[PDB]
Amino acid sequence: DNKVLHVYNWSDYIAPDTLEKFTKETGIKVVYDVYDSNEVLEAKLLAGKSGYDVVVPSNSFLAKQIKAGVYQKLDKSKLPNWKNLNKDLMHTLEVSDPGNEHAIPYMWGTIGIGYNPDKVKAAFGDNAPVDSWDLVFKPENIQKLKQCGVSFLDSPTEILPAALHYLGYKPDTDNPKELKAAEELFLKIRPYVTYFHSSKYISDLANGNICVAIGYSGDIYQAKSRAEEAKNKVTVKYNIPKEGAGSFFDMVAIPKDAENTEGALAFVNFLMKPEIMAEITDVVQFPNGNAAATPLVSEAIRNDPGIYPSEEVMKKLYTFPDLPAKTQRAMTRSWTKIKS
Residue 180 sits in the same domain as residue 324: yes
Is 219 annotated in a binding site? The answer is yes
The reply, when asked if residue 17 is annotated as ligand binding, is no
Same domain? For 208 and 93 the reply is no
- CA dihedral angle for residue 30, residue 34, residue 40, residue 44, rounded to 10 degrees: -10
Q: Are residues 136 and 187 in the same domain?
A: yes
CA distance 245 to 113: 10
Domain count, the chain: 2
Please check whether residues 61 and 84 belong to one and the same domain.
yes
Q: Could you give the CA distance from residue 117 to residue 77 in angstroms, rounded to a whole number?
A: 48
Q: Rounded distance, CA 73 to CA 100, Å?
A: 9
Q: Which range marks the domain in which residue 290 is found?
A: 1-108+249-308
Regarding whether 323 and 218 lie in a shared domain, the answer is yes
Structure-determination approach: X-ray
Which residues fall within 8 angstroms of residue 293, CB to CB, at 6 or more apart?
A: 84, 272, 274, 275, 276, 277, 278, 281
CATH of the domain at 70: 3.40.190.10
Q: Give yes or no: residues 39 and 163 share one domain.
A: no
Minimal CA–CA distance to 220: which of 233, 238, 235? Answer: 238
**Nearest of 213, 211, 207, 212 to residue 229 by alpha carbon:** 207
Same domain, 210 and 336: yes
**What gap in Å lies between CA 139 and CA 185, rounded to an integer?**
9
Q: Are residues 272 and 214 in the same domain?
A: no
* 11 appears as a binding residue in the annotation: yes
Residues 64 and 122 in one domain: no
DSSP 315-330: GG-B------HHHHHH
Resolution (A): 3.0
1 assigned binding-site residue: no
The answer on 205 and 330 residing in a single domain is yes
Position 127, amino acid: N
Q: Residue 322's CB: how many other CB atoms inside 10 A?
A: 12
Tell me the one-letter amino acid at 298.
S
Q: Do 256 and 226 reside in the same domain of the chain?
A: no
- Per DSSP, helices labelled H in 80-200 are 87-91, 117-124, 134-137, 139-146, 156-167, 176-189
Residue 129: partners with Cβ closer than 8 Å, 6 or more residues away: 135, 141
CA 102/CA 226 separation, integer angstroms: 37
C-alpha–C-alpha distance, residues 186 and 159, integer Å: 10
Same domain, 143 and 218: yes
Pair 110, 248: CB distance under 8 Å? yes
- DSSP 3-state assignment of 259? coil
How far apart are alpha carbons 284 and 302 in whole angstroms? 13
> Rounded to an integer, what distance in angstroms lies between the CA atom of residue 247 and that of residue 284?
18
User: What size, in residues, is the chain?
Assistant: 340
